[PDB]
Curated annotation (Swiss-Prot), chains A, B:
Disruption phenotype: Impaired glutamate-triggered (and Ala, Asn, Cys, Gly, Ser-triggered) membrane depolarization and calcium rise. Slight reduction of photosynthetic yield of Photosystem II. Overproduction and aberrant placement of lateral root primordia.
Swiss-Prot/TrEMBL induction comment: The induction by glutamate, gamma-amino butiric acid (GABA), malate, aspartate, acetate, wounding, touch, and cold stress stimuli is abscisic acid (ABA)-independent, but calcium-dependent. Cold-mediated induction is rapid but transient.
Tree of life domain: Eukaryota
Species this chain originates from: Arabidopsis thaliana (Mouse-ear cress)
Subcellular location: Cell membrane; Plastid, Chloroplast membrane
Protein name: Glutamate receptor 3.4
Span covered, complete protein: 456 to 505 of 959
Self-association state and partner proteins as the record states: Forms a heteromeric channel with GLR3.2.
Length: 50, 50
């Protein structure tokens, strides 16, 4: 509190955190959903070199 | 206790440990001593291409 506000990425620093599942690498947030919409892979209807 | 003794390097596993100095990489044990003996660097007494 007795300093200027130091804004550095090497200032914002925490200890090691334990996530659910006892992993310590921070898990990737995204997981592809299982809703009514699937992954609409477009595929070229190919004539030459099939 | 109700298992066979499982001896694997992936069995011997601990959590994250905090060392003195608030480091978490396990520090190297060796530090060269400051006794009465210094590091006796041998150096070739060189004649050609000095």
């Amino acid at each position: 509190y007795s300093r200027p506000p130091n804004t550095s990425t090497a200032n914002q620093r925490l200890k090691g955190i334990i996530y659910p599942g006892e992993v310590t690498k921070p898990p990737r947030g995204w997981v592809f959903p299982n809703n009514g919409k699937p992954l609409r892979i477009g595929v070229p209807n190919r004539v030459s070199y099939t």
